[PDB]
């Protein structure tokens, strides 16, 4: 079973550098080519670079040419992506993938990807504010997960006991450079007094866990 596992993702500042690793198993990297392809939140796939580990052959996209360097280590069976002069537009999920002659140029096995985020924002946990229910026989409530950096955050209701009606929206980048999302749930307008509703917010990057109870004003 062929597997490619990328790693080395994370936070850097504009102008800074990062090194991604793509470790392969069940397959020799020199028996084909190895690709990096990236994907910014909510957008399409952009091809980044390839390498042929047998020959040292490389090729880069224009948006990346002079500041990115793709490499290999055949003994380690690994491919590298050295990124330099990094900038906000480079913020993405980077996948590695392989091409094997039989598929005539097509990429056939892809890793689950690693999030690279390039920004000048300092990592910060979210402030959590209640979206309180007001005063037709059905109630909406939630909580606002505001001013956190970087992605991702995880939101759950009642420690996971509540999943019906749960919508957790994609975060938006505010002009400040900090993310913000809301998680809302609809519940029976007749259980707002025998059921506490608590949103559980976990933000790995800042190691912050917050449990906010939501109630009528």
Contacts with other proteins by CB under 8 A: the residue count is 60
Site for other proteins, residues 114 to 133, rule: CB under 8 A: 127, 129-132
Strand runs labelled E in the chain? 3-7, 10-12, 18-25, 33-39, 46-52, 57-60, 68-73, 78-83, 92-99, 107-110, 114-118, 127-131, 138-148, 154-157, 167-168, 172-173, 179-188, 197-203, 208-214
Interface with other proteins, residue 5, by CB under 8 A: no
> Are the C-beta atoms of 49 and 36 separated by less than 8 Å?
yes
Query: For residues 13 and 57, which CB has a smaller minimum distance to other proteins in the complex?
Result: 57
Binding-site member from 30, 67, 87, 124 for other proteins (CB under 8 A):
30
* Among 10-18, 102-110, 191-199, 202-210, the segment contacting other proteins (CB under 8 A): 102-110
Q: Please give the structure tokens belonging to residue 15.
A: 């102008």
Interface with other proteins, residue 47, by CB under 8 A: yes
Query: For residues 83 and 128, which CB has a smaller minimum distance to other proteins in the complex?
Result: 128
Pairing assessment for the beta strands 10-12 and 3-7 based on DSSP bridges: unpaired
> Are the C-beta atoms of 184 and 158 separated by less than 8 Å?
no
Interface with other proteins, residue 134, by CB under 8 A: yes
Binding-site member from 79, 181, 187, 199 for other proteins (CB under 8 A):
181
> Are the C-beta atoms of 124 and 151 separated by less than 8 Å?
no
- Residues near other proteins (CB under 8 A): 28, 30-33, 35, 37, 42-47, 50, 52, 54-55, 59, 61-62, 95, 99-108, 110-113, 127, 129-132, 134-135, 138, 140, 142, 144, 146, 167-172, 174, 180-182, 184, 186, 217
């Amino acid at each position: 079973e062929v597997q490619l596992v990328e790693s080395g993702g994370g936070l850097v500042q504009p102008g800074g550098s990062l090194r991604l690793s793509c470790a392969a198993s069940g397959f020799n990297v020199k028996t084909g080519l190895i690709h990096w392809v990236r994907q910014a939140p909510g957008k399409g796939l952009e091809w980044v670079a390839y390498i042929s580990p047998y020959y040292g052959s490389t090729s880069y996209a224009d948006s990346v040419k002079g500041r990115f360097t793709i490499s290999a280590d055949t003994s380690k069976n690994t491919a590298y992506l050295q990124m330099n002069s990094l900038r906000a537009e480079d913020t993405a999920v980077y996948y590695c993938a392989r091409e094997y002659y039989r598929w005539y140029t097509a990429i056939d096995y892809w890793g689950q990807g690693t999030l690279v985020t390039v920004s000048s924002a300092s990592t910060k946990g979210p402030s959590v504010f209640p979206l309180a229910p007001s005063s037709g026989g059905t109630a909406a409530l939630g909580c606002l997960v505001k001013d956190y950096f970087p992605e991702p955050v995880t939101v759950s209701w009642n420690s996971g006991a509540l999943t019906s009606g749960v919508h957790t929206f994609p975060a938006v980048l505010q002009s400040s450079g900090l993310y913000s999302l809301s998680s809302v749930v609809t519940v029976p307008s007749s259980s707002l007094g025998t059921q506490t509703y608590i949103c559980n917010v976990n933000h790995k990057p800042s190691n912050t866990k917050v449990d906010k109870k939501v109630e009528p004003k």
